[PDB]
Amino acid sequence: IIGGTECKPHSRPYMAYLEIVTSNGPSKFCGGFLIRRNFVLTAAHCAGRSITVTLGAHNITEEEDTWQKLEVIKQFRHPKYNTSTLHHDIMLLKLKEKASLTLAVGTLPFPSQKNFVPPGRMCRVAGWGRTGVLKPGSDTLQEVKLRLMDPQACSHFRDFDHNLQLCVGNPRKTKSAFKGDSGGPLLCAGAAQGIVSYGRSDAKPPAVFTRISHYQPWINQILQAN
Amino acid sequence: AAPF
Numbered sequence: 538i539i540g541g542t543e544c545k546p547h548s549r550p551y552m553a554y555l556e557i558v559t560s561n562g563p564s565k566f567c568g569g570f571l572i573r574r575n576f577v578l579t580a581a582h583c584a585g586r587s588i589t590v591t592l593g594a595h596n597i598t599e600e601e602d603t604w605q606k607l608e609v610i611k612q613f614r615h616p617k618y619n620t621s622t623l624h625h626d627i628m629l630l631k632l633k634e635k636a637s638l639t640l641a642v643g644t645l646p647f648p649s650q651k652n653f654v655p656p657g658r659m660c661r662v663a664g665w666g667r668t669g670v671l672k673p674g675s676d677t678l679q680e681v682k683l684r685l686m687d688p689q690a691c692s693h694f695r696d697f698d699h700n701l702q703l704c705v706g707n708p709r710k711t712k713s714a715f716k717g718d719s720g721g722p723l724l725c726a727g728a729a730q731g732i733v734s735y736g737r738s739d740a741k742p743p744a745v746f747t748r749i750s751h752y753q754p755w756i757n758q759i760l761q762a763n
Numbered sequence: 764a765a766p767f
C-alpha cells in the first residue's frame with residue numbers, strides 16, 4: 538500500500554496473508570480475504586505450488602495468540618484466467634480446516650449489492666504489500682482510501698475491460714495499491730466490490746481491481762461443490 | 764501492466 542496508514546491491529550479480521558511457494562524460486566506473498574470459515578478469496582496470479590494462509594495477523598514478523606496459520610489443500614483458479622491480459626484474476630482457496638472465529642479472525646460476506654458502486658465513491662483497501670517502488674513489503678497491515686474512477690481513467694491499460702474490472706485511484710494523488718497487495722478486497726460502503734489485481738510497475742494510480750459482482754455465480758458454484 |  539502506497540501512501541496508506543497502519544491499521545488498528547485486528548480491525549480487519551477477514552484479512553489473510555498468503556505465503557506462496559513456487560518451484561524455481563523464493564516464496565512470494567499476496568493478500569486475500571476469508572469469505573467462509575474454510576474459504577479465502579484472492580487473485581489468480583497469486584497461485585503457486587502450495588500456499589499457507591495466516592489469519593489474525595497484524596505485524597507478520599511477530600507471532601501472537603491471534604494467529605491461525607492454515608494449510609491450503611486446493612487452489613481453484615478461474616478456468617478463464619489469462620496470464621497475458623490478466624483477465625479473470627480471481628482464485629478461491631480451500632483451507633484444510635475451518636478457521637476459528639475470534640475477535641481477530643472473521644468472515645467478510647461476499648454481500649448483496651442493490652446497485653453498482655458509482656465512480657467518485659471513496660473506497661478502501663488494505664495489504665502488506667510494498668509501500669514504495671523500491672521499498673519492501675510492509676511488516677504491518679496498511680490501509681488506504683482510494684477513489685473509484687470512470688473506466689476512461691484506465692484506458693492506458695490496453696486490456697482493461699470495464700465489465701470485468703474496476704479502475705481505482707485518483708491519478709492526481711500518489712495513494713495506491715501496489716505489489717504484494719494483490720488479492721486484498723476493495724471495500725465500498727462496508728462491502729467488498731473488488732480485488733487488487735494489477736497496476737503500473739512505477740506505481741502510478743489508477744490500479745485495476747477485479748470486479749467481484751461479475752464472478753459471483755462462479756464463486757457460488759465452487760462453494761457449492763466443495 | 765504489473766500483476767500485484
Ligand SMILES: *[C@@H]1O[C@H](CO)[C@@H](O)[C@H](O)[C@H]1NC(C)=O
Pocket residue numbers: 596598599676677
Ligand atoms: C514488527 O515487529 C518486529 C518484531 O518482530 C519489530 O521489530 C518491528 O518494529 C515491528 N514493526 C512495526 C511497524 O510495528
Ligand SMILES: *[C@@H]1O[C@H](CO)[C@@H](O)[C@H](O)[C@H]1NC(C)=O
Pocket residue numbers: 619620621622
Ligand atoms: C490470452 O488472451 C489472448 C488474447 O488477448 C489470446 O490470444 C491467448 O491465446 C490467451 N491465452 C490463453 C491461455 O487463453
Ligand SMILES: [Zn+2]
Pocket residue numbers: 608610633
Ligand atoms: Zn494436508
